[PDB]
Write a protein that binds this ligand. Structure first.
Ligand SMILES: [Ca+2]
Length: 304
């Protein structure tokens, strides 16, 4: 299966840049923007400049209707850049002009090309004011009607994981992990045969036409590794949608040869009880003999 990550507008393109520098295998990156200066600095292999005539190579100036229209007018270049993708991740900041207006169009186009379409977007900081927050909300609602699943990261949550001195760049790297480990987690599932297998058709069943979603990875070792890794997978400090209320779950456990049946049940029960609901689970297990005492739990939850 072909996975693509599409950054749209300034925020999304920076997050794509950071992920490219972090280093990501078997994934194609597309950078889409009106801003010609930021595109030139993008590390993505595929770059699409939209709205050249509209903005003369600048950003959309916090006007989301210009973002929308720039993407509508370049829909055939966007189609060509997406063609062949089984799964597309569309990431952008909501609140401004290009991301807020263009991202829902890009996602709509991706979905009617037949790709599984996931959105990962941000809401602006409260200090940016009410109007910015309101434009962002319209953007999230537009995104929600265009994608298969939506992950929303409110930027105000970044204030929950920093101390007074944490560099702004470091804060953003933490927000990046959500998209990056979700992408990496799915990429690993697709490629890796399991003792209890999960493949792309399982990802499609749990994500298709679901609305809100959560994606998480948890790694742990030692005494209560299964339970701790599972708790870390569903921990949502940055997430708008927590695990509570999930009706559909894809869950994978990867461990070494010592991975116990009893442990797998423990981890699966954590996910069942945290959701505080009957969860309808697709469950998988990988035995990676290269691992030692490390356990890795991957969770994708939808159906809210
Ligand atoms: Ca697999």
């Amino acid at each position: 299966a072909t996975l693509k990550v599409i950054g749209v507008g300034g925020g999304g393109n920076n997050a794509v840049n950071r992920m490219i520098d972090h280093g990501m295998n078997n994934v194609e990156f597309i950078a889409i923007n009106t801003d010609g200066q930021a595109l030139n600095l993008s590390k993505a292999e595929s770059k699409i400049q939209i709205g050249e005539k509209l903005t003369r190579g600048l950003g959309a100036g916090a006007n989301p209707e210009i973002g929308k229209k720039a993407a509508e007018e370049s829909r055939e270049q966007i189609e060509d850049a997406i063609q062949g993708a089984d799964m597309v991740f569309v990431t952008s900041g909501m609140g401004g002009g290009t991301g807020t207006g263009a991202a829902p169009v890009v996602a709509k186009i991706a979905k009617e090309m037949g790709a599984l379409t996931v959105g990962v977007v941000t809401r602006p900081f409260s200090f940016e004011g009410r109007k910015r927050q309101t434009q962002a909300a319209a953007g999230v609602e537009a995104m929600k009607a265009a994608v298969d699943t939506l992950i929303v990261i409110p930027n105000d949550r970044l204030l929950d994981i920093v101390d007074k001195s944490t560099p702004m760049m470091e804060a953003f790297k933490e927000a990046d992990n959500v998209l990056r480990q979700g992408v990496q987690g799915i990429s690993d599932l697709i490629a890796t045969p399991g003792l209890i297998n999960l493949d792309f058709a399982d990802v499609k069943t749990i994500m298709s036409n679901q609305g809100s979603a959560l994606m998480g990875i948890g790694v742990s070792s030692g005494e209560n590794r299964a339970v701790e890794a599972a708790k870390k997978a569903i921990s949502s400090p940055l997430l708008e949608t927590s695990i509570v209320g999930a009706q559909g779950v894809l869950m994978n456990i990867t461990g070494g040869e010592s991975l116990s049946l009893f442990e797998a049940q423990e981890a699966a029960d954590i996910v069942q009880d945290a959701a505080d609901e009957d969860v309808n689970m697709i469950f998988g297990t990988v035995i990676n003999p290269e691992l030692q005492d490390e356990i890795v739990v991957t969770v994708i939850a939808t159906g809210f």
